[PDB]
Design a protein around this ligand. Structure first.
Ligand SMILES: O=C(O)[C@H]1Cc2c(O)noc2CN1
Ligand SMILES: O=C(O)[C@H]1Cc2c(O)noc2CN1
Ligand SMILES: [Cl-]
Ligand SMILES: [Cl-]
Ligand SMILES: [Cl-]
Ligand SMILES: [Cl-]
Lengths: 260, 258
């Protein structure tokens, strides 16, 4: 019986530093949707755990050259962590190297704009050059565009991959700042969950426009064939059925939203 | 070597083709799950036979005998190799069979005859003039049975004892019931079918309010079945290729009737 090492990522509102973090230690340093979820999962499954922020601050991709996995996925693949509890998208390529619970939350790639930006759809973005647009420099959204056979998305990708200066960002926060500071000349492609969160935060100058480009989910991830998998999956299903997940979403997204 | 698929007659997931009486085997059927089965079969490299579950149920454990019925029973008792249907992923089922990651999202929803003065579950629970129920078996009924949420528990205590029965054997009967009850019956069912029916003639029903929960349908296999892994990767590949979105638009394609 050992302490479970949880890899996660500093991404609001899933995991955030508490106000007095500088005088706090261990799990108490952090707060958020995934901090609450880790607590609920640990309890229903009966384990102790340590929250650790992934070192490279990444979600998880395989370098094409070295073939090494980075991010939280790499943490699991190379045995640095026992479980990942984070807004980590279930994808085919990931499912080939790690296990995922059934989804604890749904999302889709979405478009964030500065209020007043004349854009309603991915098709609008694709037909113009005045407003620039990009995605997270890594992760499942970038990979969606790189791999898409759908004409509109492929056209967006061919623009994005070669835009100068770079339209990609290192973090969600950077994407948000870029939309906010660009006077309507930048739109950010990101998962609907983050988009809806930011829409509820001061200065309330962003919004999600149009439908989602796809439909997918976040799953709790474990090393392939890990014994923890089964219990965590059942825990996620129980929590969903009790309404606890809906409660958590409301708590961190809307309950104390700052935009009325 | 021929995979046996248990599925269920449920529009627009699986439906009898026009002139099916002269058709044979898999060609008797059409719909979202028929296309999905074909796609899954192609990606996993197997031949298959579609079979309509004998008792016409999704799957529940009998309280007395503790025997599983419906499509879940078919997998649990070795009658089928895989279930490809709008079968809801639930904790209780996940304990006895395996599920792929979801191929479709849904939630429990409210169907009313147009003009009914109801906008939400809370409304229903606060009145008695308009009756309401669910399928006499399946995950929607179980949802209300198990719920500790105030409004939903109140709805359940009403529905379980209401006279005559507010439960129906098939979705078609629930829908017929809403249509024929002049606004005196509301039907609780999953959002996917609600939205489908809303766009079909006579265009006299509608979904009202948001969904009561959020869950998904998964392709099911007997517990620990080998087929499980391949089928899950296939579902994920189909999603990422946009094939699942294509199938949804095809079968919920709005011709305009409503
Ligand atoms: O799992 C993943 O790769 C990432 C990608 C992503 C994004 O683009 N916006 O938000 C997120 C969180 N999930
Ligand atoms: O899987 C299941 O038990 C059933 C339940 C249900 C319902 O109530 N309306 O539609 C359905 C399909 N899923
Ligand atoms: Cl409990
Ligand atoms: Cl292919
Ligand atoms: Cl029952
Ligand atoms: Cl009683």
């Amino acid at each position: 019986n050992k302490t479970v090492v949880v890899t996660t990522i500093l991404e609001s509102p899933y995991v955030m530093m508490k106000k007095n973090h500088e005088m706090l230690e261990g799990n108490e340093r952090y707060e958020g949707y995934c901090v609450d979820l880790a607590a609920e999962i640990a309890k229903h499954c009966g384990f102790k755990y340590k929250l650790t922020i992934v070192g490279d601050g990444k979600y998880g991709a395989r370098d094409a050259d070295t073939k090494i996995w980075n991010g939280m996925v790499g943490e699991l693949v190379y045995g640095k962590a026992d479980i990942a509890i984070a807004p980590l998208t279930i994808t085919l390529v990931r499912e080939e190297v790690i296990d995922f619970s059934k989804p604890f939350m749904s999302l889709g790639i979405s478009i964030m704009i500065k209020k007043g930006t004349p854009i309603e759809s991915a098709e609008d973005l694709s037909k113009q050059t005045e407003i620039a647009y990009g995605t997270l420099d890594s992760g499942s959204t970038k990979e969606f565009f790189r791999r898409s056979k759908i004409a509109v998305f492929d056209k967006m990708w061919t623009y994005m991959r070669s835009a100068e200066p770079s339209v990609f960002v290192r973090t969600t926060a950077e994407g948000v700042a870029r939309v906010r500071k660009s006077k309507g000349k930048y739109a950010y492609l990101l998962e609907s969950t983050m988009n809806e969160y930011i829409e509820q935060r001061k200065p309330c100058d962003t919004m999600k426009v149009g439908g989602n480009l796809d439909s997918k989910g976040y799953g709790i991830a474990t090393p392939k064939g890990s014994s923890l998998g089964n219990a965590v999956n059942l825990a996620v299903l129980k929590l969903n059925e009790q309404g606890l997940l809906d409660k958590l979403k409301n708590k961190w997204w809307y309950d104390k939203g700052e935009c009325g």
